[PDB]
Amino acid sequence: VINTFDGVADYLQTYHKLPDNYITKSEAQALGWVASKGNLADVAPGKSIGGDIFSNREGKLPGKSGRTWREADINYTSGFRNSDRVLYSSDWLIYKTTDHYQTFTKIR
């Protein structure tokens, strides 16, 4: 699947959407994903959680009018979700977090 920081960042800046292996939290849930059981891979084989809007409430990511943030899980294969995410904007800035949105660093 395309689920690496680089693979995903380069694909988003090109096609302007996530690769086909991503599903939002709502799509996941509908299929039977129960976060507490870490069963995403059992119920949505080869899929990763991605595409949800990220509020950025804690203002850690650069804001701008008309700008929206989205997140996508990175490096996921099976089990419980990891701590790695890509944060991308409506204007295509790309950031990464490997610590559950505590800290961010620009990648694109």
100 included as an active-site residue: yes
Q: In Å, what resolution does this model reach? A: 2.0
Q: In what order do the strands lie in the sheet with 48-53?
A: 22-23, 48-53, 69-73, 85-89, 94-97, 105-106
Count the domains in the chain: 1
Q: How do beta strands 94-97 and 85-89 pair?
A: antiparallel
Q: Tokens 């995403």 belong to which residue?
A: 40
Q: Is 71 a catalytic residue?
A: yes
Q: Which of the residues 16, 27, 58, 71 is marked catalytic?
A: 71
Best CA proximity match to 18, nearest among 65, 105, 104, 86: 86
Q: Is the dihedral of CA 79, 39, 17, 56 positive or negative?
A: negative
Residue 94: HSE in the Cβ half-sphere, 13 Å Cα cutoff:
20
Rounded Cα–Cα distance for residues 12 and 83 (Å): 20
Do residues 49 and 81 touch, judged by C-beta distance below 8 A?
Answer: yes
Q: Which domain holds residue 101?
A: 1-108
- Number of Cβ within 10 Å of residue 104's Cβ equals 17
Exposure of 24 in the CB half-sphere (CA atoms within 13 A): 9
CATH number for 93: 3.10.450.30
Alpha-carbon torsion angle 49, 55, 56, 57, nearest 10:
-140
